[PDB]
Design a protein around this ligand. Structure first.
Ligand SMILES: *[C@@H]1O[C@H](CO)[C@@H](O[C@@H]2O[C@H](CO)[C@@H](O[C@@H]3O[C@H](CO[C@H]4O[C@H](CO)[C@@H](O)[C@H](O)[C@@H]4O[C@@H]4O[C@H](CO)[C@@H](O[C@@H]5O[C@H](CO)[C@H](O)[C@H](O)[C@H]5O)[C@H](O)[C@H]4NC(C)=O)[C@@H](O)[C@H](O[C@H]4O[C@H](CO)[C@@H](O)[C@H](O)[C@@H]4O[C@@H]4O[C@H](CO)[C@@H](O)[C@H](O)[C@H]4NC(C)=O)[C@@H]3O)[C@H](O)[C@H]2NC(C)=O)[C@H](O)[C@H]1NC(C)=O
Ligand SMILES: C[C@@H]1O[C@@H](O)[C@@H](O)[C@H](O)[C@@H]1O
Lengths: 208, 208
């Protein structure tokens, strides 16, 4: 059996016009004996023809991998259009179809709160700065940390978790040396989501 | 044919001497034709016999589900012993063997910090009590919230996330009416982990 995988565009990608959001159809386990593969793309059930399909690449397991990439308009993804990738291979009894879209439901504005390091933590050589984001739908989101216009490296963000109200929440942890916090440097948690205005918000953290 | 899945005990069960830690061999996509499977259970290769098979359950797509559950000694699991679940079926040309074990490595103690709700969030009907657990290894953990010795229902815990140092972290969020927070009631975050003394620690959060 040939296998088909459909990947949605990155959240940052749909959110910013500068970026180019893409939907990607991936076909794996295409046999040597029947390597011909054809991709049909549908948007809201209507065929589209602007996809770019890369030349098939042979994997080390003697099976072929074929990828087709469709550029999507930012407003189209945000407006809930459905993307269908249809794959035909002779060695396939019926053509395989996958559909992807932004999750259904009404978008909700993310509330972004910054949390200072617990008192007990200040003992360590490193502190945890917390960016709490809650109440957002859908779950597609991006979170970033910076200081002095400068992007921090040492941060980690939890995956979105379904809250009790049907909305989503997450936490982002930024780890900085204790001295920096103590020095009064200001730290910024930045969030990108569709339900934000300009698709962006920022909140700042600093020792008081 | 049918594909197996093997599952580890819940973290709380292994930690608390009272509870029963279990390992679950789950078999799916068994068809009506030959719905008979056999389970050999092995610990560190050695055959033990105290496992038992559940009532078969028919599924929605003409498929079944035959689960066998072994019980495990708390120290056997925590000490790294390996459990093999071999599923012998007719539609399966040969048996499938799958193994599971605790994650290997020096267990690390979780640091438990409670964070008060943000000042900005305070102009809200309900507020967020944040418990941060970091530096723990391995990932298996249990988190709970309490007030006045009574469980608090309204909380969600993020899945463990791998941090830079190879330890894991998580956040647990408890939601309470702003009124309670103001009244000064104490709320406690409960963490259970192997590296903790008595497999348990408690941290308290109060308005102050
Ligand atoms: C022969 O050798 C072949 C070469 O290795 C081998 O091919 C592999 O086959 C695997 C199957 O056997 C296949 O596994 C699947 O992997 C899925 C995820 O793949 C991504 O992440 C991997 C890392 O873990 C990468 O290695 C993959 O390449 C792939 O990477 C993603 O690629 C996309 C597009 O290229 C990219 O998006 C684009 O990125 C750019 C950035 O430049 C832009 O941002 C664009 O805007 C953006 O579109 C992603 O960024 C990139 N991601 C990453 C992390 O890099 C995985 O999802 C599959 O799991 C599903 O199916 C299994 C069933 O098999 C289920 O058990 C599982 O639960 C998943 O099911 C899904 O569940 C979802 C719910 O959570 C649900 O929503 C879905 O609907 C549901 N889907 C289905 C179908 O049920 C699966 O594991 C692997 O990717 C193949 N390797 C490659 C390189 O393609 C072949 O198998 C070998 N054959 C033999 C016989 O040996
Ligand atoms: C309808 C089926 O229900 C069961 C699940 O394990 C399957 O993924 C599918 O959703």
């Amino acid at each position: 059996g040939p296998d088909v995988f459909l990947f949605p565009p990155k959240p940052k990608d749909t959110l910013m016009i500068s970026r180019t959001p893409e939907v990607t159809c991936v076909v794996v386990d295409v046999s040597h004996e029947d390597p011909e593969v054809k991709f049909n793309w549908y948007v809201d059930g209507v065929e589209v023809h602007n996809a770019k399909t890369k030349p098939r690449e042979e994997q080390y397991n003697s099976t072929y991998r074929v990828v087709s990439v469709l550029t999507v308009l930012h407003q189209d993804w945000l407006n809930g259009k459905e993307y269908k990738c249809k794959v035909s291979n002779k060695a396939l009894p019926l053509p395989e179809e996958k559909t992807i879209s932004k999750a259904k439901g009404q978008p909700r504005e993310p509330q972004v709160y910054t949390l200072p390091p617990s008192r007990d933590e200040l003992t360590k050589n490193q502190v945890s700065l917390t960016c709490l984001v809650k109440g957002f739908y859908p779950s597609d989101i991006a979170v970033e940390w910076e200081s002095n216009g400068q992007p921090e490296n040492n941060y980690k963000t939890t995956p979105p978790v379904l809250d009790s109200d049907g909305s989503f929440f997450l936490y982002s942890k930024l780890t900085v040396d204790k001295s920096r916090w103590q020095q009064g440097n200001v730290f910024s948690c930045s969030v990108m989501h569709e339900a934000l205005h300009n698709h962006y918000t920022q909140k700042s953290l600093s020792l008081s």
